[PDB]
Amino acid sequence: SAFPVHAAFEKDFLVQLVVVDLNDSMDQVAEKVAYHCVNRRVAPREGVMRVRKHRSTELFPRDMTIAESGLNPTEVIDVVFE
Amino acid sequence: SAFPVHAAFEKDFLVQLVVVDLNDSMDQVAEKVAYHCVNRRVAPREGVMRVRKHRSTELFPRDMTIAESGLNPTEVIDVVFE
Amino acid sequence: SFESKKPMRTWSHLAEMRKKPSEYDIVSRKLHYSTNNPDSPWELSPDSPMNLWYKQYRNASPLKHDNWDAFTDPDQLVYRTYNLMQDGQESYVQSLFDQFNEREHDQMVREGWEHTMARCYSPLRYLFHCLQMSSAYVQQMAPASTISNCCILQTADSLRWLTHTAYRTHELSLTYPDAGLGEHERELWEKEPGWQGLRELMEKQLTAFDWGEAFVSLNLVVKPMIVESIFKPLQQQAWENNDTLLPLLIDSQLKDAERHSRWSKALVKHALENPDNHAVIEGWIEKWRPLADRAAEAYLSMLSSD
Amino acid sequence: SFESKKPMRTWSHLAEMRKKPSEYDIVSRKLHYSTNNPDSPWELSPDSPMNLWYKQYRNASPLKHDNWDAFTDPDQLVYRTYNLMQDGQESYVQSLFDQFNEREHDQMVREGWEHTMARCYSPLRYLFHCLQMSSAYVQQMAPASTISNCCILQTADSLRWLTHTAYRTHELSLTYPDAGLGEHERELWEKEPGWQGLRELMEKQLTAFDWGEAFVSLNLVVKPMIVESIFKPLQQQAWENNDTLLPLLIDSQLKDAERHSRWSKALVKHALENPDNHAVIEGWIEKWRPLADRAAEAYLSMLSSD
Amino acid sequence: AMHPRKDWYELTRATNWTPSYVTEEQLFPERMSGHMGIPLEKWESYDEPYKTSYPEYVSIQREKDAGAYSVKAALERAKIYENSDPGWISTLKSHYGAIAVGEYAAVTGEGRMARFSKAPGNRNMATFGMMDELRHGQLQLFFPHEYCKKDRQFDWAWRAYHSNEWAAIAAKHFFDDIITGRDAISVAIMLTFSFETGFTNMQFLGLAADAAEAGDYTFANLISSIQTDESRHAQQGGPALQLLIENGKREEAQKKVDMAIWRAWRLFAVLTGPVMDYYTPLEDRSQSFKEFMYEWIIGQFERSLIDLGLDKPWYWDLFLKDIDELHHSYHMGVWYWRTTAWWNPAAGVTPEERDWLEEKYPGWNKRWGRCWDVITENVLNDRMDLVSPETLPSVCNMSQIPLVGVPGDDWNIEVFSLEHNGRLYHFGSEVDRWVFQQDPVQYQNHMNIVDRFLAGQIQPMTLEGALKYMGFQSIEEMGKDAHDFAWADKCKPAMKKS
Amino acid sequence: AMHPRKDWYELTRATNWTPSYVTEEQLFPERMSGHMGIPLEKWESYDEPYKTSYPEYVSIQREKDAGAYSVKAALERAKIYENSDPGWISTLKSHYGAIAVGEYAAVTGEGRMARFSKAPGNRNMATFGMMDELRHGQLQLFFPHEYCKKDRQFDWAWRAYHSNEWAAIAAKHFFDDIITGRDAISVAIMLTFSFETGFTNMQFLGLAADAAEAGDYTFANLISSIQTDESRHAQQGGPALQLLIENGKREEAQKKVDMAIWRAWRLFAVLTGPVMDYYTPLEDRSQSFKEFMYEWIIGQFERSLIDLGLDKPWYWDLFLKDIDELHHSYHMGVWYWRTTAWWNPAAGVTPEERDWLEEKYPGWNKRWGRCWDVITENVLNDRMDLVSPETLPSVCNMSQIPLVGVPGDDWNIEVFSLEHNGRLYHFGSEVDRWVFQQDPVQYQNHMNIVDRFLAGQIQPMTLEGALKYMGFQSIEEMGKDAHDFAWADKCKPAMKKS
Amino acid sequence: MSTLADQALHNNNVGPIIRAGDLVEPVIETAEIDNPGKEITVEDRRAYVRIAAEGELILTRKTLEEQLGRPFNMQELEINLASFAGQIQADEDQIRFYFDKTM
Amino acid sequence: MSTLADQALHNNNVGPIIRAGDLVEPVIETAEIDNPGKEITVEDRRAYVRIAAEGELILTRKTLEEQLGRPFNMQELEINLASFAGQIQADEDQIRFYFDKTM
Ligand SMILES: [Fe+3]
Ligand SMILES: [Fe+3]
Ligand SMILES: [Fe+3]
Ligand SMILES: [Fe+3]
């Protein structure tokens, strides 16, 4: 159920390896990524963190799990604010 | 045992669909491609026709079969003279 | 095998009409190839974004007919004949503008009429632009080229009306430079109560993306409301205020509006060949009527006020 | 956890030598990182073409030792000290050229000697270039940097000899312009019987790609043959023909040749620490000796002929 | 008196407002609008440089059509159909088939902008653009219609876009990608800027030059009149482009222009290239395809792109090489597989034509000339089975056109392949592969004609099966050599014993 | 008397012959030689423009070394180690580690040409090239050796290439691709032309300028002396390139140059960029990294490429954008993950340095400045856990360097992904992905450091496990902030209650 | 190719492309008259003529009306203006073809 | 970027880059003397100096020996010639830095 992704957080300078869980919601995924960015290189801010496939327009629902998303291990995601 | 390849014959202007057999030797593959090129758009000539993965340097042995080669269906091959 | 066949007198798709095909038939019929393949309207990935848009908002519309292409514009207008017709009507309107300006018409209107015009007429450019944008949407989504062509000409007519309104707002400002003419229309459209029913109606209508709902709300609800509650009441007020140009201008605009009503009714008649469509069209009319009624009431109470 | 450790006086890989490391040790030892990973010599796809080449022709060589890096050049030469040594020997040779030219040495050689030189000396530029190319091959394939460095300096020495031969072929042509000096050497290398044993030997040696076989054939078979059957016989003939420059030139070249023999013997001694290697080295020597013997015999019969 | 347009024009485009009953994003959804997050206020500075207004439009467009139709009527008896070189007639057939219904599709690109662009001037100019493309579709159906009674191949002026014929698939894949399948700002950049100020000048003016030389004034007059509208509505692109650059979207803008220009190039190389250098009779070739490319695309179009602040596309040098090579091979492919076209390709390889080709493309005879040598020999020796194909060409998964290269003495051919989501795709250039990778969701499940043949979508699996799948209804409709091989009569005869 | 070189030089390179006992292809196998089928005879016109001969070589190179070693000896007591800014000392550590053993690898690139090039002048010049690179490897081990007794990080002058430390992997993947892993003609084009007339001038002369400003003359004198050899042996590339173009191989030549320049760029952006714009003390920055790029790479190198008949690379505009952006992010990555480096990165973000960065790269403070703001705040508030990483960066499958982008106010980041043979690869640019696609067999089964971590090759799976896997032997060897965060003392203090 | 294409791209030619008909000669004449001390180049392609000057080329309504010999409004030029080189700026009095940059 | 990079690329500057030491001033002086009616530009980077002229720049052995003040052979320049702009052609008498093309 360990599931590696590569994640780019909004306003950060890089993409990082973040190992999430197959059964994680997108809300949970966003939080696991934010851990490695917010208050490290990215200023905290108000708003709702959302997950999308890298460079996509369409956002994954907040409640959707990694398993439900159709994402493959080691694919790239962005975490952005809506 | 039908096996589609895309083949570019030496001195011709295009790549063509040629359906060969899984158990065909490279000698047989070359001949099946030559059918659609030699005396149609390519002058016949002396020499031994050889098969290689497209743009490769290394040639497949004459005796090797499609099955033995590791080629996947619809991959591109060249047929050239050695 | 393959046959040897002889030439046809017209397109293969028209070759079994009994009548000689008209110019209209030759140049207008069965031109949307995007309806040929239900799974891929456009020649792209079947689930490309625009393919999904068209599968949802055209193909899946509850308004259904097995032959939308057989729809015929009652006026059988083509680009060529539209321009002949409209150059006639528009040269007439431009000649009125010239002549009435020569006679200094705007100076002779009843005291205060410029303020009524600033408030109730000049912001119509926003309303007319909304009709223009909406007509273009029905154009791009309609399931037959003969339907789309009617929408194209209707989109042009909406811009015609917008342009009359722009020209006349400017012209009136020249006689009456202290009325906000050409300066305050956005503020009125956004903030004035008499415009808010109309603004709410159009913002919501422009977000009705199903082709059938777009068509019905625009052409069967919104546009007829404009005729009965905006155009005709303005003609009456103009008569009471010695504005003799506005009634003539509106009469020309009403010719366009009647044409839009004609083709739209013809489309309904075509659609009702399918009995299922009656409840569908009725449902949307009933959905949108209250909003249109509120819009008209708010406008009329503004036109009536001091 | 991780330790806190103090600085070392030299590289970590030398830190457990008992002696203070020399310049040679510091700059020469254990520099081929391509031997670290048997499955991927180079930091590329494990089966990239050059990775396959090195796995076949270096890693899989039957000549085996568990510590090729412990090989030491007996002369412990580095770039700096090679250039000091060779500037000394080369300035000496260039001074001989100058002086012997001043004394018009080439005019005083025995009648016909220019023809012997044209036939048996000037084409040595091809042979020496083959030694140069071959030495470079052993360089790039050898499994330790200390071995490779010896090959680098040997490649330079081969070019040194080629250049002496070029310079002297040109110089001799100035006194003897009708002997084909500087004009016919390729033709002799390609066609002259006395050169064909040597040409066949080098063409085949240059296609021996296993590093160990390349090393043994070049340094234990070909090069010693050149010393005993080409260099020394030319000195003898030169003495008989009142050429007093050639024996001195060859004596300087022989200093280089002795150095190549010294390091090569040291490598054999290192290799024989593994008893398996004796039959391997013996096998290759026995494989290549007949070709070298034929080469020498054909050369000598040409040098002896009229 | 009347007041001049300059005095009231601004009111015609004072039409943006701040939404209150729905959100800005609901009214202008990004997937349809393509505003790239640029707020409404910023779009108000959009200023179309080539303006018109409703009264002027209807008056002037009335006059444009009066001329086009009058010239057609006056020349009905000029015997263009019966007296023209058949290569010219095939040029008409390929033009009307490839273009007429695509023009009508362009209405939808303009409509997309008229509803969904955040720039008010763009919405109005796009309304005229909708009208313009309606004109172009109607003209280009009306004009060939009279030839239906003469030749079933003219039915394709209407039929092509309703077919799965390979060239029709190529046209639709292009037009659906750049015109009808993307958001309003993408259309503004890709269609009006990239396509309508670029390549349409080749088919509608370059070709008009050849038409005039050929004495076909009905056609020359028609297509040049059409281009006068294009020259106006195409000026919607520049201001969109300048706005995107001003608002930090240069990179996005450049990528879209780069993509659209390449996509247009490959289609035009298959349509216009063979027309200009082979189908048009030699005496009527005003300039070569490459000369016209240097005039219209390099000298005019690309210079305009640089003036607006964009860069030369990354593939510049590949493009220049392609201009020397690609259409010669596409011509060869279309001619060899002529039975799959709705027009009759002219081979265009009589000695005098080969001398011209050599002059215009030095080295031609040692390249394509080698293939035409084999073909010519076969024709002269009546070996006709060898002039018709018994397999399919491999086809690009982007352009939908055969994968080609340079034949003959310095043979070079390259296919650029890609695995994506467990499927293997093949492209005719680095640039085509790059286009796919820019937007895989647009393309990923599309199947080209060869993919369909291999998947069992084309039944039966024979030349005949494919031809029927492609919409052919009779022997007469399928392409033949334009001159029924009478061109071999100008080649040195193949001698036989007496 | 002595005869001048011009009179006997041709005999030194009259060394080609026609093989008889083995075939030409057996003697010069394409996989090692890279002759592209060009026959022996054609290679004889190769004419190296920068010649030398054995007697001159040994004499002149003796003098070069006498000077380099004398200056070193005379300056041993200048207290460079103890008195230099630690950012300067880290520059020395990164230089010698990244370069010394790579120079010795370059012997093999030269040896590849000396045996396998069909051009006789190339084989001789490559023999001097072998000698030159031997010099450079030996100098660049000897020089740092004396610092071993002072600082374990100098051990990496020898150790780096024997490690799996990430930057060492990046260096080896580059050098093994362009120097030791390809055929002789590829080396001639890629190493000597692309790399040795291009990027080495930045690290060996640009950096020498900064060294001289910093008062480190031992180093400035060393690296400039080394470059004098490069300037000679690099002139093997031009004639190879001109020969390939003359023989119909322009396209192949251009592709190789394009590939090698980009590969060199990414490595040099991670090594030299942070050195020039951050580690070198502000007072010693002769020019910015970008200014030096414009001098050496744009103004000199690319102009030379055009003079020789090549085209600007297709990625020109991407490259220009990268020069403004890439190294700022690579610096950030190397500094944040400093514990994985064998040198101590200087942050280089005191207010005075930030003013300089803004001057040299307008907009810097609203981009990278945003990240450094967060970092600076944490340092001032002693929130040190937030200045050290708890995961891995994503890494390019070509360059082996973190995947980065522009941070801050106009955030933009892009990863260019590729599926190939049922594996997913990720690249830091369009160009890196393109390089992979040019020669997949070179790269396809290579695993980057992240791929290894995910595959279970790095045990245990922790920062510590990775650090040990990378060859670190003590706390002292792993990178720290150069100034132990003393730079925060120049930032406005974070106030607390009294 | 390289040299040829570079030369083709690095031009500053601006001006109308007029479609065969009654505007061809009047526009040529107007280009000459309304741009004194600009050399006007004309390329004749039978179906169209390519008229150009360096950097800027103006056509005034008044001149065009004189050269055409009949009443003329500037907007009417679009009946015959098939294309143009340069950016365009047009009003009731004249049309201006121009470039912002010099190549 | 665009304008800046174009200007940087479109130069015809050729000449030696000399590494700090005893050849810097003599080479500057020789460049001036041996190329009369060429403007010589010099950029001082302390560790090296960048010396240039438009299109061609010659350094003769005889001039360099005079400016250096001691016996000098042309090949010895490589002790101090760290890089150069332009193509190179060298013999016993002189070195020539040059371009074939004009940008
Ligand atoms: Fe059109
Ligand atoms: Fe258009
Ligand atoms: Fe080096
Ligand atoms: Fe080097």
Side-chain angles (χ1 to χ4, degrees), chain E residues 133 196 230 233:
Chain E
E133 309 294 16
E196 303 178 318
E230 289 300 316
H233 70 236

Side-chain angles (χ1 to χ4, degrees), chain C residues 26-151:
Chain C
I26 288 160
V27 306
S28 313
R29 290 198 178 279
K30 206 181 180 50
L31 303 180
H32 289 333
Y33 57 83
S34 60
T35 59
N36 291 335
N37 185 341
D39 188 56
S40 200
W42 306 111
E43 187 69 59
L44 300 167
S45 189
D47 298 315
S48 73
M50 203 66 76
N51 270 334
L52 296 174
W53 185 276
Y54 276 67
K55 285 185 275 192
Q56 182 182 2
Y57 289 121
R58 184 201 270 162
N59 294 10
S61 181
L63 195 71
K64 295 194 168 308
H65 195 288
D66 68 354
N67 196 359
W68 288 118
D69 275 303
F71 171 72
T72 299
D73 176 2
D75 288 315
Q76 294 202 167
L77 285 172
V78 303
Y79 181 89
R80 189 187 67 78
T81 53
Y82 174 88
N83 287 156
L84 285 169
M85 175 178 67
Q86 299 300 77
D87 192 38
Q89 271 295 294
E90 194 57 13
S91 64
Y92 160 76
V93 164
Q94 298 293 303
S95 293
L96 287 173
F97 288 168
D98 192 14
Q99 159 65 15
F100 279 68
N101 171 99
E102 286 298 304
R103 287 309 189 174
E104 299 169 334
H105 165 277
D106 291 349
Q107 299 180 15
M108 310 314 163
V109 302
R110 202 176 90 181
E111 167 67 288
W113 181 243
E114 73 270 22
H115 299 305
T116 295
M117 290 294 277
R119 177 147 297 169
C120 306
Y121 174 77
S122 61
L124 284 170
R125 79 170 181 255
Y126 292 93
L127 179 61
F128 298 153
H129 192 60
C130 286
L131 299 180
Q132 185 185 340
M133 291 170 67
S134 193
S135 296
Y137 185 68
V138 189
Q139 175 272 316
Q140 67 206 69
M141 298 311 310
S145 55
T146 52
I147 300 166
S148 291
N149 288 187
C150 295
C151 299

Side-chain angles (χ1 to χ4, degrees), chain F residues 103 133 136 230:
Chain F
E103 294 271 20
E133 309 294 16
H136 300 168
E230 289 300 316

Side-chain angles (χ1 to χ4, degrees), chain D residues 218-273:
Chain D
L218 179 68
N219 275 47
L220 311 182
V221 181
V222 172
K223 282 173 58 57
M225 174 274 291
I226 289 163
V227 166
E228 69 185 355
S229 305
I230 303 189
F231 278 134
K232 287 173 208 251
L234 276 169
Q235 295 185 120
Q236 175 65 40
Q237 276 283 95
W239 175 84
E240 294 170 2
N241 290 83
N242 191 39
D243 183 331
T244 52
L245 179 52
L246 182 60
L248 289 171
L249 175 59
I250 291 174
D251 269 349
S252 183
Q253 299 171 335
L254 285 174
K255 281 188 171 68
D256 300 336
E258 190 41 57
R259 182 168 59 252
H260 307 156
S261 184
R262 285 203 299 279
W263 81 254
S264 305
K265 301 305 178 69
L267 183 54
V268 175
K269 169 167 179 287
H270 187 72
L272 298 171
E273 295 181 339

Side-chain angles (χ1 to χ4, degrees), chain C residues 1 3 33 43 102 149 196, chain E residues 1 21 104 176 464 475-476:
Chain C
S1 187
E3 305 186 37
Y33 57 83
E43 187 69 59
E102 286 298 304
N149 288 187
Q196 298 321 295
Chain E
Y21 306 99
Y104 186 76
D176 293 353
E464 183 162 338
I475 294 172
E476 287 74 34

Side-chain angles (χ1 to χ4, degrees), chain E residues 346-393:
Chain E
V349 295
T350 64
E352 203 186 332
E353 287 170 302
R354 296 180 59 153
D355 286 346
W356 182 87
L357 292 162
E358 190 65 33
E359 177 189 6
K360 297 304 187 189
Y361 305 92
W364 187 95
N365 279 289
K366 281 157 58 79
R367 295 164 157 182
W368 301 273
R370 298 302 184 198
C371 302
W372 284 112
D373 283 345
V374 179
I375 293 165
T376 299
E377 295 157 21
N378 289 149
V379 169
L380 288 165
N381 292 282
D382 188 51
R383 292 180 285 197
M384 300 311 284
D385 63 309
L386 299 181
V387 200
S388 292
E390 293 170 43
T391 196
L392 291 74

Side-chain angles (χ1 to χ4, degrees), chain D residues 197-198 200-201 221 225 282-298:
Chain D
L198 283 163
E200 182 187 359
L201 169 68
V221 181
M225 174 274 291
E282 278 193 67
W284 285 325
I285 289 177
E286 296 313 327
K287 175 181 177 186
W288 287 94
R289 272 226 214 93
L291 265 177
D293 284 349
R294 278 176 266 158
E297 282 152 344

Side-chain angles (χ1 to χ4, degrees), chain B residues 7 9 12 14 16 33-43, chain E residues 374:
Chain B
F9 197 89
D12 205 356
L14 93 172
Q16 294 175 294
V33 180
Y35 178 80
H36 295 288
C37 310
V38 174
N39 293 313
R40 285 172 185 274
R41 299 170 306 271
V42 181
Chain E
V374 179

